[PDB]
Amino acid sequence: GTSQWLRKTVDSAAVILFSKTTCPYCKKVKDVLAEAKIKHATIELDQLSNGSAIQKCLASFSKIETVPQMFVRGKFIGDSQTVLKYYSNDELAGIVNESKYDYDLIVIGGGSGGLAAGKEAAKYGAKTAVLDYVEPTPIGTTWGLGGTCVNVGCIPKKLMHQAGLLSHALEDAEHFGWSLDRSKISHNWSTMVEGVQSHIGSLNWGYKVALRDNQVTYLNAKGRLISPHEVQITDKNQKVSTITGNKIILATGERPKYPEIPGAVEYGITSDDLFSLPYFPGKTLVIGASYVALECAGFLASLGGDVTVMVRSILLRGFDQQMAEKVGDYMENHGVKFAKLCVPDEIKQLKVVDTENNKPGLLLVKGHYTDGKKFEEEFETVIFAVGREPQLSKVLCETVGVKLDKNGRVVCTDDEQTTVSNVYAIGDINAGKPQLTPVAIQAGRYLARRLFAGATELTDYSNVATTVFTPLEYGACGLSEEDAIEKYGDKDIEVYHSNFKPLEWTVAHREDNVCYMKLVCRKSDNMRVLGLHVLGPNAGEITQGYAVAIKMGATKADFDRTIGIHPTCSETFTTLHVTKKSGVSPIV
Amino acid sequence: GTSQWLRKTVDSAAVILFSKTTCPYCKKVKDVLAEAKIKHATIELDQLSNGSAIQKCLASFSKIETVPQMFVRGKFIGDSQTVLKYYSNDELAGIVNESKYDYDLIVIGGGSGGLAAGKEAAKYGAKTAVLDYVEPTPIGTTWGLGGTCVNVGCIPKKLMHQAGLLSHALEDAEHFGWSLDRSKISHNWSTMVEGVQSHIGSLNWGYKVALRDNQVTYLNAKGRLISPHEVQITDKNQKVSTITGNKIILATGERPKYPEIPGAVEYGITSDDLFSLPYFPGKTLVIGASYVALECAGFLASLGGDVTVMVRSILLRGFDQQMAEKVGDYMENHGVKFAKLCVPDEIKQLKVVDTENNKPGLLLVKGHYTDGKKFEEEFETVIFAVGREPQLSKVLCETVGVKLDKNGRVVCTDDEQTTVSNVYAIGDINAGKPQLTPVAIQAGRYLARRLFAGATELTDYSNVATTVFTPLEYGACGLSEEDAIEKYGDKDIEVYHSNFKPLEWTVAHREDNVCYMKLVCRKSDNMRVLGLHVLGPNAGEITQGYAVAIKMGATKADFDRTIGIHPTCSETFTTLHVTKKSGVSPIV
Ligand SMILES: Cc1cc2nc3c(=O)[nH]c(=O)nc-3n(C[C@H](O)[C@H](O)[C@H](O)COP(=O)(O)OP(=O)(O)OC[C@H]3O[C@@H](n4cnc5c(N)ncnc54)[C@H](O)[C@@H]3O)c2cc1C
Ligand SMILES: Cc1cc2nc3c(=O)[nH]c(=O)nc-3n(C[C@H](O)[C@H](O)[C@H](O)COP(=O)(O)OP(=O)(O)OC[C@H]3O[C@@H](n4cnc5c(N)ncnc54)[C@H](O)[C@@H]3O)c2cc1C
Ligand SMILES: COC(=O)[C@@H]1C[C@H](O)CN1C(=O)c1ccco1
Ligand SMILES: COC(=O)[C@@H]1C[C@H](O)CN1C(=O)c1ccco1
Ligand SMILES: COC(=O)[C@@H]1C[C@H](O)CN1C(=O)c1ccco1
Ligand SMILES: COC(=O)[C@@H]1C[C@H](O)CN1C(=O)c1ccco1
């Protein structure tokens, strides 16, 4: 296995030095490389229990067994005397830039995964290009470098969530002694958007600076893989050319779907458009029931909007459904209207958007309930959140040989390799993986280290924690209660649960028994915690630390022996005792 | 060991039933006991791997080996036929109330620990009395049932902390688009206090109801242990009497100290007085540098006060000192003044408190710096936070034989037993233990279960997490960096660290590099996490979940393989990489 690792490491590393921390000759080569601004990976054999065997195996490539040994793109370059010879004769720079391809790495897609992968690879001396292009929305919206999260996802949506949370802070401040009168305060949508977009602009610029400072080539051009090593690019002037690369990472993400009904594309919008919208949406219908749909409906209501959500079947399909219903009940008691068991049939235009007075238009929405009854109502804005999909037929010629699944996503091995050996895929287009920004970043960083620095660590996709930033937030890690019961049987599942009330809500006169948490446990495995669920303020901060314990195999007993921090919401996890089987009430 | 456990369980349980879940005779005895309102512990032998051996050992007390077997205060009462005989002849109630003492348990002290212990014991049939008396402060302040945390500690202090946090929420709301003008809003101290005190009143009442519903005798009287089983009580009319109890739990807590200088007791106040103060303190000097001192100074500043803290040597002695300095720097940049290396010599009265106009008085404070230079300044309120101490000479006759340490706290074994075999001590008076409310509650609950239900689990006092609720909060679990280095040597310690900026602070234009976190790790033990530290918003919610992982022995690798939740502050722990040895900057 050592010999098989060494061959794979030597073949794919761009520039790599085998060394020992105690060798003055290695130190001498390091200095020359640093002085010449030659970036490289380094493996210190004296810090690996496998080092003696590795030192012996190197002779299979170089015919020597000593350190240092420097390699460039699979070719042994020399020991100390030889590297310094190339330096002194001004031959070293041409040797380390010698390649069959233009780039060691081409990343198609400049988002969460692709930027992480490209920056990490360049750190070990891989000559890297990152391609990013943003196809405009139907109404023309576009944005800068960074991907979906930075521009039209996690970042603007949580900032708008905070704007909505501040409405309750203003209400609570009177009870805590502050002299303001909440009923005389209003919200200005365009002032919010200007502040959100200025932060996003600082992120766009930060990414371009980071790529420049890592010597990464940034091309604002649409990429198409036409053979295993050839990428056809089209720039902003429609000029077409081809570049070559040794390794390819596909990281192109997804975009919103529209339903196939009249008026949807013409007159509706999606989350792509919402976060830079120049006018307040007004009376708004959200079609869909995903976390995107409920998060946007939630902050629109808190900012004073008249908001309706149209639900085809259930809320948050794929999440614990007891928690999903508690999430929606809270929203429905705090202003959000729901049209349940309902789908749309067409959108008709009554008024065109007023681009000069900065005002929305007006629409008539016609639909029907599952029993056949009719839906008909007017709205100023209609937002579709009915899922997201990739469009890899635009990215990937089918003759290259990259296998896709029934949904159009890329079938990968557990090290992100596609069915073409030099081509990898990360992020939302990787079939079967959780579609989250921290997953894409970890996958891209770890992959770059395996390709160019001889690392072995894989990304672990199991028990990845999540948080839904609805007006009352919902954090989770592990299995839903119904999934656990399906897998192991009701008799082997124990559920501990409790309501709770944040101390902050007492003087503010908020609700007694709305926040809720539970632990879903396996009796026959020492009461292993299979899933953790919490509905309450700051739910993502609450949940995150427990993700480490669950990764380590925490049991109910581990939660019991750990002491709480008081006063907090999170401490309620350390003293749970009421079981669902007992029938005892969970109320405070 | 089984035989030794069984004897200890039988001797101390008040009412206990040995049973099996599948026995209809046991079910029949259970029903009779439930119908007669006889509370008891129950041990189901079929759910213990030790059950066959226990069944054999019971015959050493009862001369029978079958189930059910019912015991009262160490005496075997009968099997099925015999218990039903006593029931039918109306003899059972007198048998189960037969005792050498008035009470199975007397708890001296009605606070966090004592209330928890008393309620848990009563659940297993122990006849329990809880004694609570609140000696008034020098100026006359007193309060109701619940102890220091409920009335003059964690609960009011965090509610006042929230009042102060809402001042920055009001400032931030303008940047997020809300139409308020922060500079025209003021705070009303007395309106805040009225709301805080109404919540506290609901807790006082909740505890009296809970004791009544658990059949616990509540005596509002001062207790004194005069022999191992005799408690002398003095009531509100100065009437003196004696009650007896089998087991005794001491849970009397501590009170604030005053420095031995002229004017301190006469003219200053402490945290005991602050949380119900009828007037705003005005220009305020806080003498001390504990977490109590900095927490009170912090919210007083955020509520508009002119506040000075006088520091004898260092801030937060006993906590990580890099974190302590970051905590104080933030307070000093946000309005709190510090007089460093300074102690007071006297307090002189210039104006008496105006009880009718609802106004503070005025004082002249004279002190000196450690180099000899003089301090002299006028303040309206002077608050001493220079530590807390017990006064067990008032609680405990020295002839009883309970050993105290040099600081006046009770020397206990690892099951909370004192040097007198039937007397135990929990909470802040237990020598050497962390002085926190969740520790006192766990100790009291677990102890009651060992005494009266045959449990074996001990309280684990190691690696208990904490949070200091200063204006920017500080959470910690495990060793400080300097303690880790002292124990293991600098060469064996690695520290990963990073600054961070909450997403909420970006649009609000708050500081870039003030929030900070670090992990203190042991190289020679697989990079075990010895301590975790975080300075930022919601630090107690952040820290709590990680306490479970640290209890389980988490390593740096466990933090690395766990994926973050985005966008959160807590996720920064999952991607730490900059080491202190590297010298690389931790800034964003
Ligand atoms: C509204 C919303 C809210 C979300 N909130 C969260 C949240 O709170 N937390 C969380 O963890 N995740 C959240 N997500 C998910 C997160 O945004 C994604 O998981 C993440 O952005 C996926 O990263 P990626 O690298 O796979 O792709 P992306 O970030 O989508 O980047 C792909 C990039 O490649 C570009 N591209 C596409 N085709 C080509 C081509 N042919 N040539 C060149 N460039 C191309 C795209 O235009 C895009 O810029 C949210 C998503 C949405 C829609
Ligand atoms: C300002 C402040 C803030 C704090 N904040 C926190 C925080 O955020 N988190 C945290 O975990 N901890 C906090 N603490 C600590 C916490 O309050 C204590 O650890 C906890 O209250 C100790 O519980 P106890 O049962 O040991 O005693 P106590 O809660 O002090 O209860 C003892 C009771 O017994 C009574 N008593 C005394 N003598 C007698 C007698 N002879 N007869 C009858 N009754 C008697 C006392 O009057 C009192 O009512 C704080 C403390 C202070 C002072
Ligand atoms: C997951 O949610 C549900 O399952 C509930 C019951 C129903 O079947 C679907 N549903 C809702 O539409 C809803 C709206 C507000 C609260 O719940
Ligand atoms: C547990 O975290 C996940 O992301 C899970 C993992 C699994 O693959 C299905 N899944 C999701 O559908 C999801 C949640 C939010 C966006 O997608
Ligand atoms: C623990 O704190 C310290 O150690 C610093 C340095 C000094 O020795 C003590 N000290 C402070 O008084 C202080 C005030 C505001 C920030 O720090
Ligand atoms: C780690 O948590 C603790 O409480 C530690 C444990 C240790 O006994 C010393 N100690 C304290 O002095 C302390 C902190 C807050 C109040 O007291």
Numbering used by the authors:
A (entry chain A), B (entry chain A): 6 to 593
Reproduce passages from the article.
Schistosomes survival relies on the redox enzyme thioredoxin glutathione reductase (TGR), a validated target for the development of new anti-schistosomal drugs. The S. mansoni TGR (SmTGR) (EC 1.8.1.9) is a homodimeric flavoprotein with a head-to-tail orientation between monomers. Like all mammalian TR, SmTGR is a selenoprotein carrying the amino acid selenocysteine (Sec597). Paired with Cys596, this residue directly participates in enzymatic catalysis together with FAD and at least two other cystine pairs (Cys28-S–S-Cys31 and Cys154-S–S-Cys159) with redox activity.
